Design a protein around this ligand. Structure first.
Ligand SMILES: Nc1ncnc2c1ncn2[C@@H]1O[C@H](COP(=O)(O)O)[C@@H](O)[C@H]1O
Ligand SMILES: [Ca+2]
Ligand SMILES: [Mn+2]
Ligand SMILES: [Mn+2]
Lengths: 627, 616, 612
DNA sequence: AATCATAGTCTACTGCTGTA
DNA sequence: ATACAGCAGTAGACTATGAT
């Protein structure tokens, strides 16, 4: 279920859309290329300068030298982790398509996990249904994949404009940097002109989106390759701009996210010295030097051995250069067993709280590096003690020991099992994931992250999102419990500083811690006419009813408003209008036929909505039916 | 003298004459021109037309065969049969069936030159085509010269399949596959167009179906055709295709255990060598599974050697002679590390001394049947299958059910949607009935068939006026045998809600016919992304008749009241099985009530936020 | 009268010439007239095709140019080899060098003479080392005019040809001019068989249509040649053989007449017309069969007889690897149900009853599984499009000739395949050309057919002196090129087949006095160029000095210091030269020769040419 | 700074089957 | 028959190199 419409999201959509006021879409003379390439969206330097200044002013962004640049087609959007930046850039793609008919976009991602997560979301039925209702558009997705002439590129370049389809190329950094894109082929694309993938993509005149712009440093290779596309405009989205801004259009910070409770609060748990450095294979211990691959002891460090030497590579994937250390007390059996036991006890305290309420299915995520029978024991014990859906859920948890479960293929399997994990039909709630797979977790119902054999904002962000109820809908104030080592004591102080530093000021004292109107009053009076008697009236629900006995009668009410507001395809206009106001296609057409005006744009539709709503309030017959 | 001139043209310019000895005027003209971009491509006149045809939107609606679907057998059926143009039918499936199909099997018209294939469609003026396709007026004139008139060339054939294969690709799951039957007429041309639509990297392989026995005098005796196989994504495609329930394998495990229960020591092998010596000839490909013990029948796998090149050289010690065993000519295929593991596992068969190369103990129960590229299966059995369904003579060159049965078993593994958009006689659908009633098997079939009239012929003389009628009947009969599995019928309908683009009384709609109302609900549910198998439940909202389907609620009927709205909010509050997230209503039958529905869907509590959509 | 071999050509030069020469009506002072050619087509009752399709590739116009280009090499003899007792009287040829250049030299003497072609071209798998390589060095400006394409298009093509590429366009640019020439060498009834795999089957088919025309497509064979047990989706176990012809002139049917034992059994089947009743016909035949049994290989299991001839029993009744049709068969004598096959029957009940009517079913003495009657008269009765022949025997054939080498050649074709194709397509006569020799399988097959089957074929095989892979079996044994290995294979295969031998020829670089080798090179080149077969003897003539040569009534005077001129005038018999070719680099003595020969040509004509 | 990606080479192996 | 060596074999692990 896609959340519409979140104010912090709609604000970012509008902030990119406002940059293109008075922009003109210029079609090519070439009849063949017109069907495959994008229209050239041209607008003057002054126009573009003025459009940005007005956006910055409205959004409360300082019109400084570091925040704007009229000699740059790069537009910037800043949104913190767990605020829906992906949904926002996708909704903007649909808006640039609605207003200008831009139908070909390149989504540039820096990682395979972000590529897998972006594609999953783009292909999902809930997204498809959401955007087909609101725009009467279909998105065709072309994913550039390493084969272990790229088909995604051929198909994206070759795809026809002829009108319900938006075409989108999803590509990662590794593929942008591959020779596969620079090479010459026997095959020609774009009216048989280009034998190179980059020349074929450049000719499409694309609009490029950059996900996490801090992973594309402007002076470096990846960015220089993106420059080769001679893109119309580049829209960068992220929480980190380590090289500053180009044209900052929107900023939703980490303090705003935590403060306006758009994200879960944090409840940190610190579970309670030595260092084994890699010398030259000789390893120095400070709590004596040992030689060398076999199991590392050297202490009690459980379950860890050397795999490669030159740098030394450990059994969990930890690569040590000559000088790199590791605290051997991190791998202690008692310390983990303790961390795991504590998270289980805290989960059931939250489980009986959420599953006895509509119900919310909570999840606990454990992060392993590479004892296991204990977990079951602990769950079983806490279940038999705590003995009504959670009574039957505990009964199934006792009757079975499948309450727990466990690189590009592995992330895909996580994303696949997503709807399954949130289903109250299956008992699985505890998840064991290797640290290397962390990038593939962003599950709203994860209420506990437990780093077992271990930016703080990035790691908490995996469980920051607002959870969904049994009816798969976001709850309309929860907290994520985070479990850390004895090694991390400054955790809440270092995270509270990190959130503040990233962002007159804030941040909430409670969030991250250790565990016109006169018309409205007349209407409220119309319905109205210890536990107190006033409580019984203030809690009795009713439903609005409009007393208009004829469509011919309604027609005259909308006509009056239309004439009073004289100071301001046609088919696509009326369809978009009906869906917003809501009034009959025939009655809107009838008034417009009578009226001495002439249509047709999104600005006109937005004025009729805002205007007619006010008119409706200011005037008068209406009611309230007892519901 | 005129024939002598023609012979010079054929002798020096053979490519200028088609397969039927007809003159290709343009091929000689392009030779005559030596004036001043060359690229790797299969090009044909109509490629731009085929590209248009695939992007052109549906001009129709979909509706059920209410009589057929309400029958007990067909009721909750997972199987579909659709009437209409397959291209139009596939375009309606996109919102619900992309990408959900595990396998596509199609038997398109071959371009035999004796099958009556001719390109023809519904659809333009040279002015009209030139604008939409985005090509010069001379090309739009040249295309229409063939699309409107009778054409059976490679280009006409490619214009016909391209949009069908293009849309079908969209319905395919990433791990999904397409299978296409053809003969020598269009094999290369289809294979080249599949390279275009799917990518050459996604070619799985081609199968050779040796299906005929031709004893009539000729140069080459043509006794085969092909099955081209492609995947949507070669990367997401399962690495291996194997059957674990072979008929030969199952027989041997049964015979193995039967002998094992009746005989003990050295007698077990003597009794087995007796039955083996006599039956060996029927055991292929397990005709060398001569050995037996208490764990079953096994073979000595003489599969330790290295293919083609130099391998691993080391000593394998004989357990009795204690000398190194004879080494294969190319050395071993296993590294010592793997060999040592096979020795500890007791997988090695040694000779009576070291002068014998080692073997691997492999049991018949562990046999997995692969898909060999050359299939020998007489196609003439399709007449026997059809005389058993229709005991009338000759109703349809139909495919036998014994061919697609194995391909469905390999591609799919007991589960998945099987799609045939050139149904023919209904062979694929029938094959799903036979496969399902041996299970762990529950595939769902979707087959499409055009309402093309029956020729005078046997079908016409029996009351079957269209190929669809014979197809529907064949599935009814095939369902009756095969335990009444049933299937649902759907058909394309004219778009009654359409109007010519105008603006001045334009929106002044006719009251919906009870049939029209049902056509809308069916089309809307599919368009909205719900599978044709998902049920549409009737909902009562204070007397008002609504419909619920996959989280979305439909309000088509007029006269929706304030009581209906209160009952809707009550049903959300009270009923545990009532959880909609989207409300769709018919505009023409709804402004004051239209606004009332919106305000109520925001003001009221539950705790679900319901979206409100307007349609027509 | 004055010629310098070998003249500039383009991608349509020869094509555009044939049209003007044969249709002057259709050419205006100016370009072509479409209406005039269209008028000639409509007149001969020829319809206008609606066909409009093509496979375009990068290097198409380049390939078209190389097809038209004249040779850029000379031809020599390997006289050391061709003077050996066994090889001197031979009619078989083995040529060293690039096939395209060898085929271009052959055009003049062999045009419309080849009865059959078999070739095993590179399959272009991702591991056969195939790349496009030319040994041509055109300027982009030269290609632009010759092609004719623009300078940028011309630059793109040379970048591609030197890259070198393994693509479909690379492979097509390579194959096109080789098949284009080979087609000119083939008789009107002549056939081409081409081995290929999945990699280039579609591309091969379409380029053969562009070269021969689709109407001249005979068909395609599948050679199911191996077993593959590697875990995959499809277990690929076959290969292809695309067959074309030069079709209106082709024999209606192909039948193999290689088996004397079949003909014997056909004769003996009929012969036994004297005996009619049974078991009396089976009494008289069994008696004869018990004696002659071993003289019947491979038809020696054909122990039974009936009114229609001699036959064997077939265990092909059961369904292989799969459960079949279950029904009962009642024994005609014991009147009990017959023993059912473990996997049921291959064919339905209705089929079984029809075979039981035609008495094509063999029962035991008991109610023993049934068998099918397979007749000797039917034995190799047709060329089935699916051939089941395990190509592993190529290793056996080669291990026999080369017992010292573990693996002589990488992926060699079996004699058994080539043997079969020749026997159906041909009738014991004609040239059999293989311009992609490799192991030398085609040549070897011709040695075998003429030896055992008493056929009169001539083989012409071409192989490039492509180096042997470093450290390989051939390299270890001293074989520097593939050609040195091919030559040796043919040498050892000749010794095993009654020493029929073969002649060797090799391509030479082109080019202030001559060396003796260079003198032998021009002589060999000129005789072929003039239309004489490489098997036609070049008689040495001594006109006082001299030293002249005569080949098919054409006299050659390459040698310098030609005086002696009166010795040629005196012939006396058998000497009758209608053409005089003499090396131009070896004026008045030349003007006197043309003057004297004109006076000697009455009565009655002897021409003159001054070459290079 | 410590992984994460891509492309390409080449290790490590398939299991039935022709012929002697 | 028993047995060696056949398979214009295949899939995927591992390496170099280079990105952030
Ligand atoms: N509004 C949203 N609701 C639910 N999921 C979302 C929303 N916005 C983003 N996502 C998901 O969170 C993931 C964030 O990945 P990323 O592309 O790095 O920003 C996306 O792949 C989406 O699957
Ligand atoms: Ca093969
Ligand atoms: Mn293309
Ligand atoms: Mn044909």
């Amino acid at each position: 279920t896609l959340e519409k419409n979140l104010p912090h999201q709609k604000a970012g959509v509008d902030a990119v859309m406002n940059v293109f006021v008075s922009a003109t879409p210029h079609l090519t003379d070439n009849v063949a290329v017109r069907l495959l390439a994008n229209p050239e969206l041209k607008l003057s330097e002054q126009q573009y300068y003025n459009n940005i200044k007005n956006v910055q002013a409205f959004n409360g962004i300082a019109h400084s030298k570091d925040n704007h640049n009229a000699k740059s087609n790069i537009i910037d959007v800043s949104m913190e982790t767990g605020t829906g930046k992906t949904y926002t850039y996708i909704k903007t793609i649909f808006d640039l398509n609605k207003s200008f008919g831009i139908n070909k976009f390149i989504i540039i991602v820096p990682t395979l996990s972000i590529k897998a997560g972006t594609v999953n979301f783009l292909k999902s039925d809930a997204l498809k249904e959401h955007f087909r209702d609101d725009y009467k558009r279909e998105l065709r997705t072309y994913v550039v994949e390493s084969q272990k002439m790229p088909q995604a590129i051929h198909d994206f370049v070759e795809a026809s404009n002829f009108k319900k389809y938006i075409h989108v190329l999803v590509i990662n950094s590794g593929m942008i940097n591959s020779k596969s894109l620079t090479d010459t082929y026997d095959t020609g694309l774009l009216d048989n002109q280009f034998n190179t993938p980059v020349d074929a993509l450049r000719a499409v005149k694309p609009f490029i989106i950059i996900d996490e712009p801090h992973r594309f440093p402007t002076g470096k290779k990846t960015w220089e390759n993106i420059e080769k596309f001679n893109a119309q405009y580049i829209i960068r989205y992220g929480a980190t701009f380590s090289e500053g801004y180009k044209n900052l259009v929107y900023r939703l910070t980490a303090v705003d996210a935590f403060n306006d409770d758009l994200v879960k609060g944090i409840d940190a748990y610190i579970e309670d010295n030595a260092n084994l450095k890699f010398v030259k294979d000789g390893k120095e211990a400070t709590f004596f030097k040992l030689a060398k691959s076999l199991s590392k002891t050297h202490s009690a460090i459980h379950d860890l051995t050397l795999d490669a030497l030159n740098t030394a590579v450990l059994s969990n994937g930890i690569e040590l250069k000559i000088g790199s250390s590791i605290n051997p007390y991190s791998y202690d059996q008692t310390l983990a067993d303790n961390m795991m036991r504590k998270a289980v006890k805290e989960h059931f305290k939250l489980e009986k709280e959420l599953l006895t309420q509509p119900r919310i299915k909570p999840l606990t995520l454990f992060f392993i590096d590479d004892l296991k029978t204990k977990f079951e024991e602990y769950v079983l014990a806490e279940a038999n003690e705590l003995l009504y859906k959670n009574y039957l859920e505990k009964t199934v948890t006792n009757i079975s020991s499948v309450h727990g479960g466990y690189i590009e293929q592995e992330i895909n399997e996580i994303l696949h099992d997503k709807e399954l994990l949130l289903s109250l039909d299956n008992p699985r709630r505890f998840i064991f994931s290797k640290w290397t797979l962390r990038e593939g977790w962003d599950n709203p119902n994860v209420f506990q992250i437990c780093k077992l054999r271990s930016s703080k904002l990035q790691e908490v962000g995996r469980g920051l999102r607002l959870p969904v109820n049994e009816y798969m809908c976001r709850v309309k104030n929860f907290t994520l419990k985070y479990y850390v080592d004895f090694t991390e004591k400054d955790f809440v102080d270092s995270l509270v500083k990190e959130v503040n530093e990233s962002s007159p000021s804030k941040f909430t004292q409670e969030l991250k811690e250790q565990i016109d109107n006169f018309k409205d009053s007349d209407a409220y009076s119309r319905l109205k006419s210890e536990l107190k008697e006033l409580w019984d009236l203030i809690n009795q629900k009713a439903v609005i009813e409009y007393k208009i006995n004829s469509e011919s009668e309604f027609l005259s009410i909308f006509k009056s408003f239309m004439l009073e507001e004289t100071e301001r395809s046609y088919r696509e206009f009326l369809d978009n209008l009906s869906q917003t106001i809501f009034v009959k296609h025939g009655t809107l057409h009838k008034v417009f036929c009578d009226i001495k005006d002439t249509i047709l744009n999104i600005q006109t539709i937005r004025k009729i909505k805002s205007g007619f709503s006010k008119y409706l309030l200011n005037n008068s017959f209406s009611l309230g039916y007892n519901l | 003298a005129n024939s002598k001139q023609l012979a010079v043209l054929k002798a020096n310019f053979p490519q200028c004459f088609d397969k039927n000895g007809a003159f290709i005027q343009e091929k000689l003209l392009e030779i005559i021109r030596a004036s001043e971009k060359e690229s790797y491509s299969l090009n044909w006149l109509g490629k731009s037309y085929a590209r248009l045809l695939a992007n052109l939107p549906p001009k129709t609606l979909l509706a059920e065969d209410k009589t057929h679907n309400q029958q007990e057998e067909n009721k909750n059926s997972q199987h579909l049969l659709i009437k209409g143009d397959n291209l139009e039918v596939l375009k309606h499936m996109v919102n619900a069936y992309a990408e959900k199909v595990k396998m596509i099997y199609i038997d398109p018209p071959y371009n035999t030159g004796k099958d009556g294939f001719v390109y023809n469609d519904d659809r333009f003026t040279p002015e009209q085509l030139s604008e939409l396709a985005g090509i010069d007026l001379d090309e739009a004139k040249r295309i229409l010269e063939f699309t409107t008139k009778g054409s059976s060339s490679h280009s006409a054939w490619l214009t016909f399949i391209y949009p069908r294969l293009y849309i079908a690709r969209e319905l395919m799951r990433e791990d999904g596959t397409i299978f296409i039957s053809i003969d020598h007429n269009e094999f290369s041309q289809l294979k080249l167009v599949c390279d275009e639509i799917f990518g050459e990297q996604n070619h799985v392989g081609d199968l050779v179906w040796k299906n005929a026995t031709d004893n009539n005098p000729s140069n080459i005796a043509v006794e085969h055709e092909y099955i081209i196989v492609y995947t949507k994504n070669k990367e997401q495609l399962i690495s291996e295709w194997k059957s674990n329930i072979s008929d030969v394998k199952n027989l041997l495990v049964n015979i193995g255990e039967e002998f094992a229960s009746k005989y003990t020591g050295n007698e077990l092998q003597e009794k087995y060598t007796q039955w083996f010596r006599e039956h060996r000839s029927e055991l292929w490909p397990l005709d060398r599974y001569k050995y037996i013990d208490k764990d079953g029948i096994y073979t000595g796998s003489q599969s330790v050697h290295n293919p083609g090149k130099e391998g691993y050289r080391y000593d394998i010690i004989h357990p009795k002679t204690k000398k190194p065993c004879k080494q294969p000519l190319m050395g071993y295929r296993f590294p010592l590390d793997t060999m040592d593991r096979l020795l500890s596992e007791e997988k090695i068969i040694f000779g009576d001394d070291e002068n014998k190369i080692i073997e691997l103990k492999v049991y018949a129960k562990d046999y997995k049947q692969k898909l060999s590229s050359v299939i020998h299966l007489d196609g003439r059995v399709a007449t026997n299958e059809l005389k058993e369904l229709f005991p009338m003579t000759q109703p349809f060159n139909a495919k036998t059910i014994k061919l697609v049965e194995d391909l469905i078993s390999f591609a799919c593994d007991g589960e998945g949607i099987v799609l045939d958009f050139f149904a023919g006689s209904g062979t694929t659908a029938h094959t799903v009935f036979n496969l399902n009633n041996k299970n762990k098997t529950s595939y769902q079939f979707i087959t499409v068939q055009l309402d093309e009239p029956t020729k005078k012929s046997d079908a016409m003389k029996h009351g079957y006026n269209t190929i669809f009628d014979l197809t529907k009947e064949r599935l009814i009969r095939a369902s009756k045998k095969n335990r009444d599995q049933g299937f649902k019928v759907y058909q394309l309908m004219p778009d009654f809600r359409a109007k010519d683009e105008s603006e001045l009384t334009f929106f002044d709609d006719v009251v919906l016919t009870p049939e029209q109302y049902d056509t809308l609900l069916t089309t809307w549910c599919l368009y909205d992304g719900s599978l044709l198998t998902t049920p549409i439940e009737d909902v009562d909202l204070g007397g008002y008749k609504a419909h619920l389907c996959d989280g979305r609620l439909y309000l088509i009927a007029p006269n929706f009241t304030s009581e209906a709205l209160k009952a809707l909010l009550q049903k959300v509050d009270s009923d545990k099985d009532f959880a909609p997230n989207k409300v769709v209503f018919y505009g023409s039958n709804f402004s004051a009530k239209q606004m009332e529905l919106n305000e109520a869907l925001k003001s009221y509590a539950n705790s679900i936020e319901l979206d409100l959509v307007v349609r027509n």
